Amino acid sequence: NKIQQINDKELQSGILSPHQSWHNEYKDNAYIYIGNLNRELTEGDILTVFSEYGVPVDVILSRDENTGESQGFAYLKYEDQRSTILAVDNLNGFKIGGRALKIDHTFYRPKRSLQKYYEAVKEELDRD
Amino acid sequence: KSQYIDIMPDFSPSGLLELESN
Amino acid sequence: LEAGSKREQSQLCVATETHLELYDTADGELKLIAKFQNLFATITSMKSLDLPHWPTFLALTSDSGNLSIVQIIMHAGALRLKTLVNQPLTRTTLRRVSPISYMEIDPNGRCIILSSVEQNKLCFLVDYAQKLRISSPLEIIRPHMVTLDMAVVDVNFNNPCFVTLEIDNAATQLSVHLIFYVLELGLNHIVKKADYLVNPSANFVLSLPDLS
Amino acid sequence: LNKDEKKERTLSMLLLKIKNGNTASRRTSMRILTDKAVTFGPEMIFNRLLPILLDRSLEDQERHLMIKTIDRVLYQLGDLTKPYVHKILVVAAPLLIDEDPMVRSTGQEIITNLSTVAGLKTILTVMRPDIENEDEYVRNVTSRAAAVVAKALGVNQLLPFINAACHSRKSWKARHTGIKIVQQIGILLGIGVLNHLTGLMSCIKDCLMDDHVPVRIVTAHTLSTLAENSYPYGIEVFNVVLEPLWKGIRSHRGKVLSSFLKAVGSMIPLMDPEYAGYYTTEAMRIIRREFDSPDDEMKKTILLVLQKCSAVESITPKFLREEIAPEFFQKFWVRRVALDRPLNKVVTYTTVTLAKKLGCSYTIDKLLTPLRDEAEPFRTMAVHAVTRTVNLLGTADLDERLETRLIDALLIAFQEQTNSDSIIFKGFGAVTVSLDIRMKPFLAPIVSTILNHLKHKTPLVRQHAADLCAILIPVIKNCHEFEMLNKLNIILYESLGEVYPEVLGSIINAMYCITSVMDLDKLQPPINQILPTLTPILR
Amino acid sequence: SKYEDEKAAEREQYLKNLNMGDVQKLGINVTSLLGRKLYDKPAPENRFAIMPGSRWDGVHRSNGFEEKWFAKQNEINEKKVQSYTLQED
Amino acid sequence: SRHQFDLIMCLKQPGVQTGLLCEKCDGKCPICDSYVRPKRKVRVCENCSFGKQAKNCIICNLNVGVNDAFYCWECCRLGKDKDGCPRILNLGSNRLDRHFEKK
């Protein structure tokens, strides 16, 4: 609802196409921070809603090291960037499980401690 | 050698996504 | 005057209701330097304020309920009496509630403090910069207390204090009691520290410096 | 009954006329209440009146006519029982959160009247079961209601109430809301909090240490409000709290870091020069680390601290230019900032404050990249910073090159504007006034674009073409391009039969600026041919 | 120190390269472009014409913006024609 | 205010800061509301200063202030000058009621 507020102002002025859009600030970014998730949505189900706008190559769900349950945020890289422009913009503020999730562009830095979780995820997304 | 990592992904449907449609 | 560079605390200004004058000393004998223009008010107090970092300029409250800080200055060929700040206080006449008639100044120049007889006492908090600057006043109102002799305590920069002999206006018996006040710079308000009841004969207060 | 059943109608008729009635009707039925409110049973009034305010149907025009009757009735009777004081607060208090300030105030106008009527002892009994309440919205309401009571009666009478709630180990939520009461006490009382700051500090510090984070966070905000509202005077009472903040900053991160830094950020300007240099250079380490935080709550805190620090003597303007400044303009001037208003107001204000410590020539140097940018809404942001800065900065600093680049940036940012706003004109007019005699070479091409835009179809652009003449005239006389003055004047004369009133008004305004300045004899049309063209315009 | 700097640079590069979208990197232009699995049934229309991933459930999920961009897209594209055609004299 | 009876002045000890008036209320005495012959700057108390509140006209306290506010000659002869802070606190019955009718 922070970002959703921008695009309405932006569009209203007829900004139209990325050169003048704030989405142009990125261009080298693909991963999207996916916030305010419900707790029971897992990687496969976050890999349901987000293929509407593109083809995901990677995904990471943030979850506590001990109990292994959702922190409530994920990082999902689309194959073709412009999906990011599309997902952030179009799907932000949308309800799943009662709570309206947040998306925004992100620069994502991998962490050693999950290293195996990368191949374990990749191998499934490497199937396609 | 016990487990790769204690965490690991799922790739399993939750009842929430299917439920909302029906 | 007459010296390119000289600064000596020997010089004095003397006023009477309307009139005001300036004398010098250091010649051993009191000389008249200037008599200034005709004031047309009733000067109810006059006290030099010497503030750190500069001449001294006599702070002068009168009828008109103005606190007027005036700097006597040399302009054209003769001395004139030039004004810097006149802050409004109450109304114009010499009237019991209005805060004049007792004006005593923090010896370092941190603040002026005024009182009335009865009701209110004010304290203005002086500062110097590219131009002289007064703070918004600091009020204490003790409703029935007529005041006599406000004399003020020196302090080494701690927090300015002052002492009064106040007598209550509505009481069955005459009790005139001495009362200390401390402006607390930190929280910026005037506090009443100590209050002692002394025999009715009390007449005046004076400050003893340090005792060290 | 049948006699007194008539009063039962009359009030219900009056209460009808007020709510739904002709303007000449309700005006007579308000006069009847204010006189007769005494003779009617306050039971009968409130029991009949109050239920209306609980329906979901009533419009805002109809609601404020009912509240205006409660306010006029409460003003008279003066002795009111507790059952209704609970009812009235159920109705009145939810106003305090309402969207617009006009409603917010008329809600506050009630409770400050009720507080005196119902007296101190009665209301504080009605808040106690209410503050312990489980429901959130009810707690958010009576934080604001109990604070309005505090101003009316004075806070000291109400302070042991808060101290009971805040320090209460009984309920967690009483601690929480008991602390919110301190904000809206500190917000209402404004500067005057002060003398009460010591008594309030009983609540804040000890209630800070709570294991519940949402309480930990609230006090960190209630300090930043007490810190600001106090301003120069306070610090001596805030040393007690300064120690536990840092051990909270050096660990907790998250949103506890956003709140603790807001507190510490707003204590700085009231610290001594000795410490104030210390804590900022401490805090400036934290900010540099948090520039990447995507949260909003943190960005609002990062701006506050940058905003505060420049004032402090200890940091030099060299240190800023060398480090803080280049890492500022690049991160906070992204186009994603210019879009949302609540974070635009902050970044420009933060830029403007840094412009004092920073050389004016340094900030304006960095604002040329956004003034030339492609995005429209981003060029408008960088204009506000210059105009705001421009009054703030003198143009004496600028070398000739920026003076030429600045004006090209503005003309552009002037000639693509879409929405109508004052900012471009004041800005482009605060620049000219500063450098006026230096403007001469740049004044030829600018006037060409005014004459080009007065031919443009969209009527907004013919406003801004003429609105920017009224600004340049006092510049031009200094310049001496009188022929242009007579060139602009004729061109403004031939347009003076325009259709659009918004545009025709501003042309006359520029005519009025040219006329006053110029030699009376000189004017081209001239005057004797102008004035008879105006007389039919008065109609 | 130099070696350290080099290492840092390398890591930065790695970070950036990982982040970059795949189609741009091969790029050079503008059933999958990179042979990734693709959906089957007809998808909702889109600004960029991108096709949903094989794994899509088939429910509309949108705030409703993407359709409102077309309304503005159509508008702006229409008033370029309306401006001349409605001109008169 | 002279003609609008519900509004309540401040009447506290004036500090050192000057009141401001919006373009609309500009050139008015805050007491008698007369446009003629000003004399003295107004001075408002601290607790009418502080933050956003200080900027707003001292008459309507709604619009933002620009010019200083003066007392008229006649109100300086009577002495209503030095009563106190001449700043209106509430918005009053007239302003509200216009507001709601319009919407």
Residue F84 per-residue DSSP state: S
Of E16, E18, E61, the CB nearest to A52: E61
- Closest-CA distance, B16 to chain A, in angstroms, reads 6
Rounded-to-5 percentages of helix, strand, coil across chain A: 40, 25, 40
C182 at interface of F, judged by CB pairs closer than 8 A: no
Q: Are C28 and C88 in contact (CB under 8 A)?
A: no
- The full 3-state SS of D391-450, as one line of letters, equals HHHCCCCCCHHHHHHHHHHHHHHHHCCCCCCCHHHHHHHHHHHHHHHHHHHHHHHHHHHH
Report in angstroms the alpha-carbon separations of A47 from A121, E23, E54. 11, 20, 11
User: Hey, which residues does C78 pair with through a beta bridge?
Assistant: C75
Residue spans of alpha helices (H) in D310-340: 317-319, 326-332, 335-339
Supply C64's token pair.
Answer: 């008109």
CB contact under 8 A, C188 and D237: no
Nearest to C102 by CA among C48, C151, C169: C151
* A5 inside 8 A of chain D by CB: yes
Q: List for chain D the helix, strand, coil content (%; round to 5).
A: 80, 0, 20
Tokens representing A46 are 């976050």
Rg (CA), chain A: 15
- Please list every residue in chain C whose beta carbon sits closer than 8 Å to the beta carbon of residue F46: 136
Q: Which residues pair with A62 in a beta bridge?
A: A73
Burial of C192 (0-12, 13-18, 19+ CB in 10 A): exposed
Nearest chain A residue to B17, by CA: A45
Chain F CB within 8 Å of residue C134 CB: yes
The set of residues, in sequence order, having a beta carbon less than 8 Å from that of D195 and lying 6+ positions away, is: C187, C189
User: Could you tell me how far CA D478 lies from the centroid of its own chain?
Assistant: 38
Single-letter amino acid, residue D535 = T
Token digits of residue D438: 């230096």
Q: How many helices (H) and strands (E) does chain B have?
A: 1, 0
Instruction: Label residue D232 exposed, middle or buried (CB < 10 Å: 0-12, 13-18, 19+).
Output: exposed
Q: Which residues of A touch E60 (CB under 8 A)?
A: 52
CA geometry: angle C198, C200, C202, nearest 5 deg: 70
> Is the backbone of residue F27 left (phi > 0), alpha (psi -120 to 50) or beta?
left
Contact between chains at C87 and F16 (C-beta distance less than 8 A): yes
Q: Name chain F's partners: 3 or more CB pairs within 8 A.
A: C, D
Residue D19, SS3? helix
- 3-class SS at D32? helix
Q: Which of residues 12-71 of E touch A (CB under 8 A)?
A: 15-16, 18-24, 32-34, 36-39, 43-44, 46-48, 50-57, 60-63, 65-66, 68-69
From CA F80, how far away is CA F86, in angstroms rounded?
9
3 state DSSP class of C153? strand
Chain F contacts of D192, Cβ < 8 Å? 46-47
| Cα C112 to Cα C109: distance, rounded to the nearest angstrom | 8
> For chain C, how far is it from start to end, CA to CA, in angstroms?
39
Strand partners, A75: A33, A60
d(CA D439, CA D444): 9
Residue E43: CB atoms within 10 A of its CB come to 18
Length of chain E equals 89
Q: In 3D, which of C101, C96, C102, C136 has the Cα closest to residue C119?
A: C96
Distance of CA F9 to the CA centre of its chain: 8
CA F29 – CA F35 distance, rounded (Å): 7
Pair D142, D127: CB distance under 8 Å: yes
C-beta of residue C65 within 8 angstroms of C-beta of residue F43: no
Angle at B11 between CA B10 and CA B13, to 5 degrees: 105
Task: Determine if residue C35 is left, alpha or beta; phi over 0 gives left, psi from -120 to 50 gives alpha, anything else beta.
Answer: beta
Distance between terminal CA atoms of chain E? 76
> What is the β-pairing status of strands C78-88 and C66-75?
antiparallel
Q: What is the CA radius of gyration of chain E?
A: 22
The domain tally of chain E equals 1
Cβ pair D195:C186 closer than 8 A: no
Say if A100 is an interface residue toward chain B (CB within 8 Å). no
The Cα D424–Cα D465 span in angstroms is 12
**How many CB contacts within 8 angstroms connect chain C with chain F?**
26
List the single residue in A30, A93, A128 with the smallest CB-CB distance to E20.
A30
Angle between helices D101-117 and D119-131 (to 10 degrees): 120
- Domain containing E65 equals 1-89
Give Cβ neighbours of residue D41 (< 8 Å, ≥ 6 apart): none
Is F46 in Cβ contact with D60 (below 8 Å)? Answer: no
User: In whole angstroms, what is the distance from residue C147 CA to residue C119 CA?
Assistant: 9
Backbone angles phi, psi at D250, to 5 degrees: -75, -5
Q: What are phi and psi of D214, to 5 degrees?
A: -60, -20
DSSP string, E3-40: HHHHHHHHHHHHHHHHHS-HHHHH------TTS--B--
Distance, CA of D216 to CA of D214 (rounded, Å): 5
- DSSP letters spanning C39-54: --S-EEEEEEE-----
In chain A, the residue whose alpha carbon lies closest to the alpha carbon of D337 is: A22
Tokens of C121: 């006492």
Long-range contacts of F89-93 (CB under 8 A, 24+ apart): F89/F7, F89/F8, F89/F9, F89/F10, F89/F61, F90/D105, F90/D109, F90/F6, F90/F7, F90/F8, F91/D102, F91/D105, F91/F60, F91/F61, F91/F62, F92/F1, F92/F4, F92/F6, F92/F7, F93/D68, F93/F4, F93/F6
Residues in chain A closer than 8 A to B10 (CB atoms): 42-44
Please list, in sequence order, all residues whose beta carbon lies within 8 angstroms of the beta carbon of residue F66, skipping any fewer than 6 positions away: F20, F21, F22, F23, F26
Mark whether B and A touch (3+ CB pairs within 8 Å).
yes
Residue type (1 letter), E72: K
- Return the exposure string of A31-46: e unless at least 16 CB atoms fall within 10 Å of the residue's CB, then b: bbbbbebbeebbbbbb
The nearest alpha carbon in chain D to C184 belongs to D233
Pair C35, C21: CB distance under 8 Å? yes
Q: What angle do CA A121, A122, A127 make, to 5 degrees?
A: 110
Per-residue CA distances from C82 to C16, C69, C70, C135 (Å): 18, 9, 6, 21
A103 vs A2, A11, A24, A59, D405, CA distance in Å? 10, 18, 16, 14, 39
Q: How far apart are CA D168 and CA E31, in angstroms?
A: 66
- Cα C203 from Cα D203, distance rounded (Å): 46
Q: Are D335 and A2 inside 8 Å of each other by CB? A: no
Contact check, Cβ <8 Å, D190/F97: no
The DSSP output letter for C144 is T
Verify whether the Cβ–Cβ distance D336 to A5 is below 8 Å: no
What's the token pair of residue D228?
């600001």
Instruction: Name the residue among C65, C135, C139 with its Cβ closest to that of F82.
Output: C65
Name the residue among C150, C73, C82 with its Cα closest to residue C117: C150
Cα–Cα–Cα angle for C115, C117, C123, rounded to 5 degrees: 10
**CA D359 centroid distance within chain:** 28
Task: Show the 3-state SS of D469-495.
Answer: HHHHHHHHHHHCCHHHHHHHHHHHHHC
3-class secondary structure, B14: coil
Query: Which residues in chain D are contacts of C187 at CB distance < 8 A?
Result: 194-195, 197-198, 233-234, 236-237
A95 touches chain D (CB under 8 A): no
Comparing CB atoms, the residue among A16, A79, A94 nearest residue E61 is A94
φ and ψ at F67, to 5 degrees?
A: -80, 160
Supply C199's token pair.
């025999």
Distance of CA E23 to CAs A82, C183, E12, E50, Å? 10, 73, 21, 12
Give rounded-to-5 percent helix, strand, coil for chain E: 50, 0, 50
Q: Which of D264, D270, D279 shows the shortest CA–CA distance to D235?
A: D270
Cβ of D339 within 8 Å of Cβ of A9? The answer is: yes
Taking alpha carbons only, the member of F41, F46, F52 closest to residue F82 is F41
User: What is the rounded distance in angstroms from the CA atom of residue C31 to the CA atom of residue C189?
Assistant: 43
Q: Do chains A and D touch (3 or more CB pairs under 8 A)?
A: yes
**CA D104 to the chain's CA centroid:** 15
Distance of CA D20 to the CA centre of its chain: 35
- Please, where are the H alpha helices in A1-128? 3-12, 43-49, 82-91, 115-125
Nearest-angstrom CA–CA distance, C136 and C123: 9
As a whole number of angstroms, the distance between CA F7 and CA E84 comes to 57
CB distance C135–F81 less than 8 Å? no
Q: Across the interface, do A9 and D377 touch by the CB < 8 Å criterion?
A: yes
CA B11 to chain centre: 5
Contact A55 E19 (CB under 8 A): no
- CB A73, CB A62: distance < 8 Å: yes
What's the CA gap between D360 and D397, in Å, rounded? Answer: 7
Task: Tell me the backbone φ, ψ of residue A110, rounded to 5 degrees.
Answer: -75, 150
User: Which single residue is written with the structure tokens 């309700």?
Assistant: D26
Amino acid at D421: D
User: Which residues of chain B neighbour A58 with C-beta distances below 8 Å?
Assistant: none
The H-assigned helical ranges of chain F are: 52-55, 73-77, 92-102
Separation CA F10–CA F88 (nearest Å)? 6
Q: Is residue C4 helix, strand or coil?
A: coil
Dist CA A35 CA F22 (whole Å) = 46
CB within 8 Å: F43 and C89? no
Residues 6+ apart with CB under 8 A from C63: C41, C42, C43, C44, C92, C93, C94, C100
Residue of C nearest to D197 (CA): C187
Supply D258's token pair. 């956003």
Using CA atoms, how far residue D108 sits from D91, D93, D207, D229, F8, in Å, is 12, 8, 28, 20, 15
Which DSSP string do the residues of D192-248 spell out, in sequence order? G-GGGHHHHHHHHHHHHT-SSHHHHHHHHHHHHHHHHHHGGG-GGGTHHHHHHHHHH
Q: Is D525 on the interface with A (CB under 8 A)?
A: no
Q: CA-to-CA distance for D491 and D509, rounded, in angstroms?
A: 14
Q: After which residues is chain C broken (C to N over 2.5 A)?
A: 53
A79 CB neighbours in chain E (<8 A) are: 21-23, 32-34, 36
D377 touches chain A (CB under 8 A): yes
DSSP assignment of D275-300 equals: HHHHHHHHHHHHHHHHTT---HHHHH
Rounded CA Rg of chain B: 14
List CB contacts (< 8 A) between A82 and chain E. 21, 48, 50
Q: Is C32 helix (H, G, I), strand (E, B) or coil?
A: strand
- DSSP for A44-72, written as a single string: HHHHHHTTTTS-EEEEEEEE-TTT--EEE
| Residue spans per domain, chain A | 1-128
